[PDB]
Amino acid sequence: TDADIAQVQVQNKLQLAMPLLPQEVQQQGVSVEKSSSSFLMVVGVINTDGTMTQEDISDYVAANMKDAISRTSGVGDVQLFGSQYAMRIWMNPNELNKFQLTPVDVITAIKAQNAQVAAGQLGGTPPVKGQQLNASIIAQTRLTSTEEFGKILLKVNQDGSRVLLRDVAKIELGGENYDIIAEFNGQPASGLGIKLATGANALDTAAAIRAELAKMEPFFPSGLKIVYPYDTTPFVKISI
Amino acid sequence: PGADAKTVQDTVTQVIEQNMNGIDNLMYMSSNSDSTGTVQITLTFESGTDADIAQVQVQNKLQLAMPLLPQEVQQQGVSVEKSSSSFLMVVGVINTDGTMTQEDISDYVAANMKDAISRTSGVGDVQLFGSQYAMRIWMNPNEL
Amino acid sequence: STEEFGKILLKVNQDGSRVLLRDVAKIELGGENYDIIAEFNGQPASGLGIKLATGANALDTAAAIRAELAKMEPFFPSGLKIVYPYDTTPFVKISIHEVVKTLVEAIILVFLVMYLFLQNFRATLIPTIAVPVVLLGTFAVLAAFGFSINTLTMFGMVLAIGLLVDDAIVVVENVERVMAEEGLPPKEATRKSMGQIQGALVGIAMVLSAVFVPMAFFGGSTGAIYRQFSITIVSAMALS
Amino acid sequence: PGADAKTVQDTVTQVIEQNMNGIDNLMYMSSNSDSTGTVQITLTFESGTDADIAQVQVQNKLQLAMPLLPQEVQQQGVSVEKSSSSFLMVVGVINT
Amino acid sequence: LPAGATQERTQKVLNEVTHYYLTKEKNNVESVFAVNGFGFAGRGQNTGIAFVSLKDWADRPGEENKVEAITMRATRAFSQIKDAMVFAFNLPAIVELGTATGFDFELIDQAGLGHEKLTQARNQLLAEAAKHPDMLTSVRPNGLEDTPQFKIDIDQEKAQALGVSINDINTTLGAAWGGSYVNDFIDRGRVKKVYVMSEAKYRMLPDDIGDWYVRAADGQMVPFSAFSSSRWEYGSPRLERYNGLPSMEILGQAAPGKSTGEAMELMEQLASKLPTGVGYDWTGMSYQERLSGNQAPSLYAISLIVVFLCLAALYESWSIPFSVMLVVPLGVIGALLAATFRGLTNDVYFQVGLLTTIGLSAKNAILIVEFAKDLMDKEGKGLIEATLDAVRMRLRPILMTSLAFILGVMPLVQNAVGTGVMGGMVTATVLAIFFVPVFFVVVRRRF
Amino acid sequence: EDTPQFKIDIDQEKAQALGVSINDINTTLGAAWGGSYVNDFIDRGRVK
Amino acid sequence: GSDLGKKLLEAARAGRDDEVRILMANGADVNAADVVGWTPLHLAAYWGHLEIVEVLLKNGADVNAYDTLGSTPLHLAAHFGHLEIVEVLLKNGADVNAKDDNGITPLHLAANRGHLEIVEVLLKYGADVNAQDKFGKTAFDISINNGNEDLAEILQ
Ligand SMILES: CCCCCCCCCCCCCC
Ligand SMILES: CCCCCCCCCCCCCC
Ligand SMILES: CCCCCCCCCCCCCC
Ligand SMILES: CCCCCCCC
């Protein structure tokens, strides 16, 4: 069976089912992948300085390495042994009840004040006669720091005090999920579990992954090293 | 509609780019995000790659990433096309007597001419330079 | 219609009087956007960018497009005119025109130069037969390999006609020479003449293949252009 | 769903049909829009054509129309698959 | 046009550009397709292209009426224009490829430096490229510079106090100023869009922001000025990315005399001196022509090895092959003189032109050597005797083909190209009839 | 193998009686104990 | 703006010191406005070019020039953390209590982005700590909303 055709047929049928799926499941991104059941190689990532936590290493791999390895031809599936960071709002139910608020009010406030608005332009098309200037209007942009999420105004009291999001929750960067924790010879690590795409060559794909990692190595932070704890390709190369 | 370069990149460009994975024989992926409220993401492939397979693989990974884009972009919708602006010819349509705007000309070409040129023998693709009519509501803030 | 959009009810006031969309907004048919202002010699303009279908004919499609536009003439509003600011058809015609010229032109001059030296109309026809046979043969091999009639294959075929003329002269001249210097009959003179050059002609086929074939094994854009000249010339030369 | 033949044709069938221009080895294209809401555009290809590539090239050109379609039509989802006109057999089921 | 330049201004330039072409080039120009709004560096109100359609080749006689000539004249007259950077340029031979001369450089933000820091790292590379005119020329950014934009902050406290939802505020703003696609309608049996937007004269200057009113929860109509506060700042109207990461495309070419390969090697050296977290990659033609370079010597090597081996089997000798293969420069040099004298360029047509001349001069030599060698083998003749008999027997047919060629080419004597392959074959024939005899005797004496 | 799981029933009458929404009850429960993906933000140039 | 005035704005914005110095010699308008009302001093102050700020002030550039929304160069310098440009501007007679159309002072902007040293220098040159924006918010109110205790200690 041509795997490229098999994927197109499977996805054609999935596309009919996609809108029937819950709203939350679609936003997590449904993925259709053709690959081997097991791993080609694992690309381990450790910090020899100790200036980065196990959380920090996983976040760097996700944001600065994974996407490029996932795009590499011959790579069927990439598995992050860890999790990319997310703006974690840790709600306190005592503090929420104290100001008569719910998780609903927290969710409404974030959607309202972490907005990327399309506000249009000054002197936009079609303009009037003898128009002077043409400039983009910049309204609200996405929040960038934990401190900005901190000062999200939830409500204003009768006396004139303000309830901020930092008053009813602990706000920090942290894994989208906290399920996967990797360790290389005791010391903490992240890594990419790379599966070989259906039909693609093992050795040629391995070379292309190394080639892409080599382009990143120069731009690593302090004491971030790559390690190869699992690789099937060296056996193939030497046995031949 | 009415989005700045940064808004487009942060909400559309980065989201589609992040989902362009498991696509065969990719060389590089350049993209532009400008203040006309527009994004273009060109995926260039290895020579001898089946351009039909290369397009459907790109088309498929976008569709699963469509729920992640904003309401206004999903509504507008996103198009995937093969990139070879090698035209056979370009037919210009003009108005000499000055009874028609470019809006009126484009709409006539779209309604009457375009579909007929498309069905013409040996014509692979047809592209209208300008858009057909749209119902414009020009709001008055003093009256509102 | 605009009337229907105008009569959209926004509000009903206390007294019973109405507020419509037309009362708070101007309504008309217009463009989706007003970013572009297209003009052709300071006159409002639009257009159609047309692309050729896979395995189609650029000359037939072009003529067919002009035929369809000509039958839309009587249905156009007043002032509307078709213009052709860009067209690749002119260049395709010339690429074919030069090949037909060079063939006709070659067959004439070979006939003259064959008669100027050998001085008999019987010998002058043998080039006139062989050159057309090989060119028609070349078109069959281009079709089999799955090439098109384009500038690169045709200006490569122009250079090929030069090689075809030599193979025609080399054989006939050597028979006419062997007949002159030994006085042999046409049949035995040919057997001896071919016996002298047959090993060399096979040798030349390999040597010119060695020159022209590796040109086609370049990668990417350059390789694609080089393949057009390579397959045309090697095919034409090998058939000769 | 719940749209007459005319409204279904004007908003879906024409929008899809007018982007099915220039597909490799396309002989003819029969289509119909009915009062139930259904569209069924059938593209029949030249004998010997690779049916899998034929499907792919239709799916590519269909995604030009997909943005222009109504919101509810996209919600129901649009299928692109190789078809056959006749039933091989009918398998009846009864209760005795 | 510069930053904050309107559509009405860009048209006035395009009007003057079209006025020039239909006036001062009425003999040459057929039409001008003026497109305000679009550009090949970026889009917007402040950009435009003019597609100039010329008349037939016949109606434009001489080199003065060609594109290259009209282009240089056009750019001079448009240098006069006040608030614009206008210049004409010919279309590339193959529209499908692009510019297809010089290099295409992508400068990449490799470690989340941001927009403002990559802007400076680019300016540091541009400044360095300017200090090597001998190697690099026309090193420029292929994109728009940062422009003024109207930052507007919504006071969340004031909006909540007056009882105004943010949804209503951002929608009122985005719909009025930006325009909002609502739903579809049917104009004469065809589906078409419905856009709500402010009438032009209420969405032009910051003064107009104050004229927009959002209804509060209590019922009051709150003006936009009550809960808004605006200032100016600089942001990019066109952000670029390459392989997921932020980038800036830099175009350029090798300086006259220098190869495009050298120019790239310097650009690589200059790039290695930029701030940390700033990488680079080669895209477009630079990616293509770097793939070509590696292959070239391997394919040249195979060509000669196969030629040698094929001649070796033909003649049954390792040495005699060289007598044929030494003819290559004799066919080549004629074409090179014809090119340099008349002023042609070494292009892909000219290169395949050389290969055919080499091929046909080799063809002539292969028979001369074959006849010469056979006379020595069969009839037991001497080296000089056999060579002299060979070149005599082969003189007529070589001159017959050569006469047919120069008679076939001289209708072109269009005059410029007419001497190219004419001169290439004249020397190829003249030299080979004298030099091939030499090559055979010199080789068979030594080996 | 099967494991103990905390079954929780929502009395619809008592909810309607007090005037609490059912969506508010399920969101509050789902968000707090499960986690709610609200929207995206920009962490040093990247969407997260 | 003049023909030269345009090249001074581009040069002042860029940071090309030599080009400015020659345009000062050729008598380029030091008070040449942008489309939005930014003088070369604004552009130099915003993009942080100390050399050009000093050279422009030397050639009689207006230190209290304001754009179409009433923002002086001191706003731009204070807001974007350009310490030694705030010093130079205040020394050459910049209005430390300059209100834009929103009633925002340089002290407000410096406090908001949390540039501690600039806030002290502004206060030293007599910045009004009790000054309010259109909403009625002091530089102190901005510090407690951001939760900057270091900044909150100073502003009193
Ligand atoms: C669109 C592609 C069509 C292919 C046409 C091929 C025609 C072949 C006919 C000649 C065969 C000669 C074999 C040597
Ligand atoms: C029977 C003929 C005797 C003369 C032999 C000539 C052999 C020429 C063959 C050259 C081609 C080499 C193939 C690799
Ligand atoms: C006998 C030599 C044959 C080699 C085949 C390749 C020819 C075309 C390559 C031209 C490269 C020139 C670069 C300026
Ligand atoms: C591959 C070339 C071999 C040459 C050998 C020469 C024998 C004397």
| Per-residue 3-state assignment (H helix, E strand, C coil) for chain F | CCCCCCCCCCCHHHHHHHCCCHHHHHHHHHHHHCCCCCCCCEECCEEC
Query: What tokens does A88 get?
Result: 């974690």
Handedness of CA E113, E114, E120, E123 (dihedral sign): positive
Q: What is the DSSP letter of C53?
A: P
Q: Which burial class, exposed, middle or buried, applies to A158 when counting CB atoms under 10 A from its CB (0-12, 13-18, 19+)?
A: exposed
Cα–Cα distances in angstroms (integers) from residue A237 to residues A73, A234, A240, E171, in the given order: 20, 5, 6, 61
Strand, coil or helix: B61: helix
Strand, coil or helix: B137: strand
* Residue A196 bridge partners (DSSP): A75
Measured CA to CA, the distance from residue G86 to residue G77 in angstroms comes to 6
Measured CA to CA, the distance from residue C94 to residue C87 in angstroms comes to 13
Q: Are A118 and B37 in contact (CB under 8 A)?
A: yes
| Closest to A135 (Cα-Cα) out of E259, E208, C187, G7 | E208
Measured CA to CA, the distance from residue E20 to residue E98 in angstroms comes to 27
Region class of C9: left (phi > 0), else alpha (psi between -120 and 50), else beta: beta
Strand-strand pairing, B89-95 and C80-87: antiparallel
Cα–Cα distances in angstroms (integers) from residue A58 to residues A51, A62, A64, E378, in the given order: 14, 6, 10, 82
Cα–Cα distances in angstroms (integers) from residue E186 to residues A18, C2, E189, E372, in the given order: 29, 11, 6, 87
Provide DSSP, A85-107: EEEEEEE-HHHHHHTT--HHHHH
- Tell me the residue range of the domain where G40 lies: 1-156
| Closest to D11 (Cα-Cα) out of D33, D31, D30 | D33
Query: What tokens does C119 get?
Result: 């001085």
Residues 6+ apart with CB under 8 A from E55: E27, E28, E29, E30
Q: Does A87 share its domain with A174?
A: yes
Query: What tokens does G78 get?
Result: 């204070």
Residue C110 has, within 13 A of its CA and on its CB side, a CA count of: 30
Give how far the C-alpha of residue E230 lies from the chain's centroid of Cα atoms, to the nearest Å: 44
Q: Does A184 share its domain with A76?
A: yes
> Residue E380 Cα, ligand 2 centroid: separation in angstroms?
21
- Write down how long chain D is: 96
- Tell me the residue range of the domain where A118 lies: 83-178
Q: Which burial class, exposed, middle or buried, applies to E240 when counting CB atoms under 10 A from its CB (0-12, 13-18, 19+)?
A: buried
Give how far the C-alpha of residue A132 lies from the chain's centroid of Cα atoms, to the nearest Å: 43
Q: Are C143 and C149 in contact (CB under 8 A)?
A: no
Q: Are B134 and E193 in contact (CB under 8 A)?
A: yes
* Residue E49 bridge partners (DSSP): E35
Q: Are E282 and E103 in contact (CB under 8 A)?
A: yes
Task: Work out the minimum CA distance from E4 to partner chain G, whole angstroms.
Answer: 7
Chains contacting A (3 or more CB pairs within 8 Å)? B, C, D, E, F, G
The Cα angle at residue C126 between residues C121 and C129, in degrees rounded to 5: 120
Measured CA to CA, the distance from residue C187 to residue C190 in angstroms comes to 5
Measured CA to CA, the distance from residue B4 to residue G95 in angstroms comes to 34
Q: Are D77 and A12 in contact (CB under 8 A)?
A: no
Q: How many CB atoms lie within 10 A of CB E57?
A: 12
In chain C, count H helices and then E strands: 7, 6
Q: Are A62 and A84 in contact (CB under 8 A)?
A: yes
Q: Are C229 and E351 in contact (CB under 8 A)?
A: no
Measured CA to CA, the distance from residue A83 to residue A79 in angstroms comes to 10
The distance between the two most distant Cα atoms of chain A, rounded to a whole number of Å, is 80
Measured CA to CA, the distance from residue E328 to residue E308 in angstroms comes to 13
Give how far the C-alpha of residue C156 lies from the chain's centroid of Cα atoms, to the nearest Å: 11
Q: What is the DSSP letter of C77?
A: P
Measured CA to CA, the distance from residue E429 to residue E424 in angstroms comes to 9
Query: What tokens does C71 get?
Result: 């039958």
CB-based contact G68 E3, cutoff 8 Å: no
Method used to determine the 3D structure? X-ray
Cα–Cα distances in angstroms (integers) from residue C60 to residues B119, C90, C142, G100, in the given order: 14, 13, 20, 68
Residue in the block written with tokens 């005035």: G5
* Residue A91 bridge partners (DSSP): A169
| Residue whose CA is at the smallest distance from ligand 2 atom 4 | C199
Provide DSSP, A193-229: EEEEPTT--HHHHHHHHHHHHHTTGGG--TTEEEEEE
| Closest to A193 (Cα-Cα) out of A73, A40, A34 | A40
The answer to whether E308 faces chain B, any CB pair under 8 Å, is no
Q: Which burial class, exposed, middle or buried, applies to G75 when counting CB atoms under 10 A from its CB (0-12, 13-18, 19+)?
A: buried
CB-based contact G146 A135, cutoff 8 Å: no
- Write down how long chain G is: 156
Q: How many CB atoms lie within 10 A of CB A142?
A: 20
- Write down how long chain A is: 240
Q: Are E105 and E252 in contact (CB under 8 A)?
A: yes
Q: Which amino acids bring their CB within 6 angstroms of ligand 3?
A: C 211, 214-215; E 299-300, 303, 351
Tell me which chain A residues have a C-beta less than 8 angstroms from the C-beta of B72. 118
Tell me which chain A residues have a C-beta less than 8 angstroms from the C-beta of C33. 125
Query: What tokens does A113 get?
Result: 């004040």
Measured CA to CA, the distance from residue A90 to residue A171 in angstroms comes to 6
Backbone phi, psi, residue C40, to 5° = -125, 95
Measured CA to CA, the distance from residue C121 to residue C143 in angstroms comes to 35
Residue A209 has, within 13 A of its CA and on its CB side, a CA count of: 29
Name every residue in C having a CB less than 8 A away from some CB of A: 33-35
Query: What tokens does C212 get?
Result: 């022209």
Handedness of CA B102, B104, B108, B111 (dihedral sign): positive
Nearest CA in chain B to A70: B21
Measured CA to CA, the distance from residue A76 to residue A70 in angstroms comes to 8
Q: Are E234 and G48 in contact (CB under 8 A)?
A: no
Tell me which chain D residues have a C-beta less than 8 angstroms from the C-beta of E189. 10
Residue E20 has, within 13 A of its CA and on its CB side, a CA count of: 23
Residues 6+ apart with CB under 8 A from A69: A43, A75, A78, A192, A194, A209, A212, A213
Measured CA to CA, the distance from residue A111 to residue A108 in angstroms comes to 5
Q: Does A170 share its domain with A191?
A: no
Backbone phi, psi, residue E278, to 5° = -130, 105
Do you find a cis peptide bond into A126, omega within 30 degrees of 0?
A: yes
Query: What tokens does B37 get?
Result: 């409220």
| Residue whose CA is at the smallest distance from ligand 2 atom 11 | C203
| Closest to A7 (Cα-Cα) out of C174, D59, E197 | D59
Region class of A233: left (phi > 0), else alpha (psi between -120 and 50), else beta: alpha
| Closest to E156 (Cα-Cα) out of A151, A101, A99 | A151
- Tell me the residue range of the domain where C118 lies: 88-240
Tell me which chain E residues have a C-beta less than 8 angstroms from the C-beta of C117. 396, 400
User: How many structural domains is chain G composed of?
Assistant: 1
Give how far the C-alpha of residue E19 lies from the chain's centroid of Cα atoms, to the nearest Å: 29
Q: Are E152 and E229 in contact (CB under 8 A)?
A: yes
Q: Does A106 share its domain with A73?
A: no
Backbone phi, psi, residue G121, to 5° = -65, -45
Region class of E17: left (phi > 0), else alpha (psi between -120 and 50), else beta: alpha
Cα–Cα distances in angstroms (integers) from residue A234 to residues A72, A204, A228, in the given order: 20, 12, 11
In chain B, count H helices and then E strands: 6, 5
Q: Are C47 and B129 in contact (CB under 8 A)?
A: yes
What Å resolution does this PDB entry report? 3.0
Q: Does A62 share its domain with A124?
A: no
Provide DSSP, A22-33: -HHHHHT-----
Q: Roughly what angle, to the nearest 10 degrees, separates helices E284-315 and E348-378?
A: 10
Measured CA to CA, the distance from residue E405 to residue E22 in angstroms comes to 44
Measured CA to CA, the distance from residue C68 to residue B119 in angstroms comes to 10
Give how far the C-alpha of residue E158 lies from the chain's centroid of Cα atoms, to the nearest Å: 55
| Residue whose CA is at the smallest distance from ligand 1 atom 10 | C140
Query: What tokens does G155 get?
Result: 């502003």
Strand, coil or helix: C8: coil
The Cα angle at residue C129 between residues C128 and C133, in degrees rounded to 5: 120
Measured CA to CA, the distance from residue D15 to residue D65 in angstroms comes to 6
The answer to whether A70 faces chain B, any CB pair under 8 Å, is yes
- Write down how long chain F is: 48
Q: Roughly what angle, to the nearest 10 degrees, separates helices G3-14 and G17-25?
A: 150
Q: Are E178 and A116 in contact (CB under 8 A)?
A: no
Nearest CA in chain C to B98: C79
Residue C16 has, within 13 A of its CA and on its CB side, a CA count of: 0
Handedness of CA A124, A125, A129, A131 (dihedral sign): positive
| Closest to B88 (Cα-Cα) out of C50, E388, F28, E200 | C50
Measured CA to CA, the distance from residue E27 to residue E36 in angstroms comes to 25
What residue type is assigned to position G105 of the chain?
Answer: T
Measured CA to CA, the distance from residue E362 to residue E370 in angstroms comes to 12
Residues 6+ apart with CB under 8 A from E162: E216, E220, E222, E226, E227
Residues 6+ apart with CB under 8 A from D84: none
Region class of F21: left (phi > 0), else alpha (psi between -120 and 50), else beta: beta
CA of C140, closest atom in ligand 1: 12
Cα–Cα distances in angstroms (integers) from residue E211 to residues B142, E206, E207, in the given order: 7, 10, 8
Answer yes or no: is the C-beta of C201 below 6 A from any ligand 2 atom.
no
First vs last C-alpha separation in chain A: 28
Q: Are B89 and C89 in contact (CB under 8 A)?
A: yes
Strand-strand pairing, E213-215 and A224-231: unpaired
Q: Are A78 and A240 in contact (CB under 8 A)?
A: no
Q: 3-state SS of chain B: helix, strand, coil percent to 5? A: 40, 25, 35
Query: What tokens does C51 get?
Result: 């692309």
Strand, coil or helix: C90: helix
Q: Roughly what angle, to the nearest 10 degrees, separates helices E383-393 and E420-446?
A: 160
> Residue G105 Cα, ligand 1 centroid: separation in angstroms?
79
Sheet harboring A121-122: ordered strands across? A121-122, A135-138, E147-154, E228-235
CB-based contact D22 C53, cutoff 8 Å: yes
CB-based contact C27 B134, cutoff 8 Å: no
What residue type is assigned to position E372 of the chain?
Answer: A
| Closest to A152 (Cα-Cα) out of A119, A116, A115, A122 | A115
Measured CA to CA, the distance from residue B77 to residue D67 in angstroms comes to 4
**G–A contact: 3+ Cβ pairs < 8 A:** yes
SS in 3 state form for chain E? CCCCCCHHHHHHHHHHHHHHHHHHCCCCEEEEEEEECCCCCCCCCCCEEEEEEECCCCCCCCCCCCHHHHHHHHHHHHCCCCCCCCCCCCCCCCCCCCCCCCEEEEEEECCCCCHHHHHHHHHHHHHHHCCCCCCEEEEEECCCCCEEEEEEEECHHHHHHHCCCHHHHHHHHHHHHHCEEEEEEECCCCEEEEEEEECHHHCCCHHHHHHCEEECCCCCEEEHHHCEEEEEEEECCEEEEECCEEEEEEEEEECCCCCHHHHHHHHHHHHCCCCCCEEEEECHHHHHHHHHHHHHHHHHHHHHHHHHHHHHHHHCCCCCHHHHHCCHHHHHHHHHHHHHHHCCCCCHHHHHHHHHHHHHHHHHHHHHHHHHHHHHHHCCCCHHHHHHHHHHHCHHHHHHHHHHHHHHHHHHCCCCHHHHHHHHHHHHHHHHHHHHHHHHHHHHHHC
What residue type is assigned to position A8 of the chain?
Answer: V
What residue type is assigned to position E364 of the chain?
Answer: N
CB-based contact A85 F41, cutoff 8 Å: no
